[PDB]
Amino acid sequence: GIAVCNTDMDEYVRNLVPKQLTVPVQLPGFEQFFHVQFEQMETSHDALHD
Amino acid sequence: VQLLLDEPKVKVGEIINLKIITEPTSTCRRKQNSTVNFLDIVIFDSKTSKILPRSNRRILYNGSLTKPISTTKVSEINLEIIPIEKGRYEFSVCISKSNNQDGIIQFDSENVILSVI
Amino acid sequence: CKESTKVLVKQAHNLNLGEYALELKSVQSDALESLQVEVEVQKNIGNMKNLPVSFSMDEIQARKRYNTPFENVRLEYYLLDQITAFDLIIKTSFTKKNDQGTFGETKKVRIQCYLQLSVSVEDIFKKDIFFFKFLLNSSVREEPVILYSS
Known part of the structure; x- marks a missing residue:
């Protein structure tokens, strides 16, 4: 099932090496916002989570 | 199983080795067949x-979390919990013996919590 | 004429080692199909062929679907194209001709070279910090891939 196969691995295993690109694909519009809020009671506070 | 951790009070952009430590038992003598036994790591909120x-x-995290242990001795394991935009997490494991469904045989209760600021 | 249509053993020779021959393989290439021959010989080995022994030429060359036999080339990179297949064939011949003996060979190899480690990406992007998260998968189904750097 597992006969410690990394012990007899490095003598004969060939090292293939794919090397793909990496795009850093993105969009371009920087800005900011900050909305502020204050909760109005309905039923009871339900313990809100972000 | 114990769970050995670096800090509970890490900020956001930082990398943490998590280290579970497992102790196989005297009462593994019922099987011995799969010496390899597959765990999981599950993260609760x-x-x-x-x-x-x-x-x-x-x-x-790095790699699939299944990360096998032996039924031989005190094996160790690892992940790299690269945290992002959080607070108050929880880590716990389970033991699954195999890969298939209904292979799962126990659920430990060791629940180490960490906070993220 | 022996007239042995059947009822015998046919062929009784072995491709042993300790002899100068040719070996064509593929390794270490970035998402663009190729090949790599190897020549383990000495003292001026001659030219060799690399044919396109396909039925309909799916393993195509770049502009004209050529074979482009080499000449005193040991290791190279036949940057092919792919006209819609996942299997091929390659009859390779090499006039070795060491000393006073016109040594030749013809090996009809069957290399199929679709990719295995199919990798997808996803970024996340916070305020003045940035992380990628890479998906890693095997393009074949239930033939497994080990992986030991990234």
């Missing part, structure tokens, strides 16, 4: 409702 494998914007 410390409210309810565990995060998926695709823990998008919550927690990040």
Whole structure:
């Protein structure tokens, strides 16, 4: 099932090496916002989570 | 199983080795067949409702978490919990013996919590 | 004429080692199909062929679907194209001709070279910090891939 196969691995295993690109694909519009809020009671506070 | 951790009070952009330590028992003598035994690591929010494998914007990690142990001796394991935009997480394991469904045989209860500021 | 249509053993020779021959393989290439021959010989080995022994030429060359036999080339990179297949064939011949003996060979190899480690990406992007999260998968189904750097 597992006969410690990394012990007899490095003598004969060939090292293939794919090397793909990496795009850093993105969009371009920087800005900011900050909305502020204050909760109005309905039923009871339900313990809100972000 | 114990769970050995670096800090519970890490900020956001930082990398943490997590280290579980497992102790196989005297009462593994019933099987011996699969010496390899597959665990999992599951992450709970410390409210309810565990995060998926695709823990998008919550927690990040290296490799599949299944990460086998022996029924031989005190094996160790690792992940790299690269945290992102969080607070008050929880880590716990389970033992699955195999890969298939209904292979799972126990659920440990060791629940080490960490906070993220 | 022996007239042995059947009822015998046919062929009784072995491709042993300790002899100068040719060996064509593929390794270490970035998402663009190729090949790599190897020549383990000495003292001015001659030219060799690399044919396109396909039925309909799916393993195509770049502009004209050529074979482009080499000449005193040991290791190279036949940067092919792919006209819609996942299997091929390659009859390779090499006039070795060491000393006073016109040594030749013809090996009809069957290399199929679709990719295995199919990798997808996803970024996340916070305020003045940035992380990628890479998906890693095997393009074949239930033939496994080990992986030991990234």
